[PDB]
A paper describes a structure:
Instead, new virions are extruded via the phage-encoded [name] protein, which has homology with bacterial secretins. [name] is a secretin family protein, with sequence similarity to bacterial secretins at the core of the Type IV pilus assembly machinery and the Type II and Type III secretion systems. Fifteen f1 [name] subunits assemble to form a gated channel in the bacterial outer membrane, with associated soluble domains projecting into the periplasm. The C-terminal domain integrates into the bacterial outer membrane and forms a double-walled ß-barrel with a central gate forming a stricture at the centre.
Residue numbers in the entry:
A (entry chain A): 108 to 134, 140 to 198, 235 to 274, 290 to 308, 310 to 369, 378 to 403
B (entry chain O): 260 to 274, 290 to 308, 310 to 369, 378 to 403
C (entry chain B): 108 to 134, 140 to 156
The structure:
């Protein structure tokens, strides 16, 4: 016998090309010097004569991907309490609106995991176990030919002021999926729209109390995703 | 080689206690190639909260962990998060006549950039 | 012997096509380089 040569890996870390090169030489024989991105291989000369042309099909320039999450929640809302005690006449007309646009972003090499997490680290009784509660996006993209296959988890959480339980209640919003994106496309990775039209009315079919409530909540959440190959 | 910088506070967290750095930290593991650099990177920017809503201490977290490919003197957007909250509220009357109205327009943007340079 | 070639997978992740390709070659011989969606196979 076996000669031992060193090969300079130019485009990828030499450490990732150990298993692949362990096969080419199979019939520890491959090692990586991480400092100067080198592969030291020991194998018959014949085998080691063809290794140059295998490392030109396996040591290629990897692409970087820019995933760009988009969370969007619009909540409208109204109400109309209306008493008519008989002559006190209470009323109310509460409106409400809300637009939250959270745009997380993360660049990662193809075939690598990347995560962004911005929020709060909160302890949760289980003995305690800490846990991130805020916006996070974990990605694992793989570019192909361009297309991207993307395993994605987007979580948008917050803490609640409710003390109705043992510990702390969190407001959750999560999607986890795998999708297929083109090189500069936006997909609806998911969503939830919601609509509540409550209405109430106690009456009389000498005092004459005669209330009436109403409500018309409407909410919509969208989760979009745009991936872009950087090259 | 691995290198890390950590500036902040070392805070004990109940788990029995386990101490843990809470501040700015950056752990790197770069490999230069031919020039290009492949960089496994974790940047954490954390702080302590004054909230006593839970068992122990709440921390304000901000972290990126990725692997990217940088040239010899380039800056990349290793990641980020922009946020926008436009809340609006309005109780009225459709004898007293209370008639409040709240509003809010928070906007926030975080960027995490990274520049690697081969010294030789 | 066995030659070792690399195949570019275009439509699906190359990692899902390891068991399937392990059968075609059966008679670790198949590996996936996840970065550039490639299958390195060693077989006659
Ligand atoms: C108000 C924004 C406008 C977004 C836009 O104009 N374009 C997309 C890219 C956004 N960027 C991340 C580049 C900008 C961020 C600002 S940054 O600060 O990052 O520069 C978004 C939020 C909700 C979006 C609609 C809903 O989903 C429903 C539906 C889904 C379909 O699928 C496409 C059509 C449709 C009607 C959507 C249109 C549009 O999309 C809307 C209005
Ligand atoms: C405009 C689009 C199309 C249509 C399709 C389904 C419709 C809703 C549903 O019908 C349920 C509900 C019935 C109530 O009675 C009135 C309110 C509500 C929320 C409707 C409102 C609206 O009309 C929707 C969104
Ligand atoms: C105010 C600074 C200026 C930075 C600058 O002028 N150049 C970069 C190198 C910084 N240094 C570390 C050398 C200086 C530190 C001072 S020291 O004390 O270390 O000497 C930074 C902070 C936010 C930056 C923008 C955003 O990201 C969005 C966007 C991303 C693209 O990617 C590039 C374009 C753009 C528009 C950015 C431009 C610029 O970049 C900004 C204004
Ligand atoms: C200037 C850039 C381009 C555009 C693209 C998406 C836009 C925002 C979204 O539309 C969500 C939201 C809707 C509200 O109604 C008004 C406020 C807000 C925050 C918009 C502000 C602004 O216009 C943005 C950043």
């Amino acid at each position: 016998d076996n000669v031992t040569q060193t090969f300079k890996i130019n485009n990828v870390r030499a450490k990732d090309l150990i298993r692949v090169v362990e096969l080419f030489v199979k019939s520890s024989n491959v090692l990586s010097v991480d400092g100067s991105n080198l592969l030291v291989v020991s194998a018959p000369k014949d085998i080691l004569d063809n290794l140059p042309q295998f490392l030109s099909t396996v040591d290629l320039p990897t692409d970087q991907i820019l995933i760009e999450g988009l969370i969007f929640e619009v909540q409208q809302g109204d109400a109309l309490d209306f008493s008519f005690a008989a002559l006190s006449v209470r009323a109310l007309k509460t409106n409400s609106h809300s637009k939250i646009l959270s745009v997380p972003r993360i660049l990662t090499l193809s075939g690598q995991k990347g995560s962004i997490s911005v929020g709060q680290n909160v302890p949760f009784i289980t003995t305690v176990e800490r846990q991130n509660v805020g916006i996070s996006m974990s990605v694992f993209p793989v570019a192909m030919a361009g297309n991207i296959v993307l395993d994605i988890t987007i979580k948008a959480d917050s803490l609640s002021s409710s003390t109705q339980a043992s510990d702390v209640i969190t407001n959750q919003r999560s999607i986890a999926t795998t999708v297929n994106l083109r090189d500069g496309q936006t997909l609806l990775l998911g969503g939830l729209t919601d609509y509540k039209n409550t209405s109430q009315d106690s009456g009389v079919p000498g005092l004459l109390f005669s209330s009436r409530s109403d409500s018309n909540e409407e909410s919509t959440l969208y989760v979009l995703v745009k991936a872009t190959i950087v090259r």
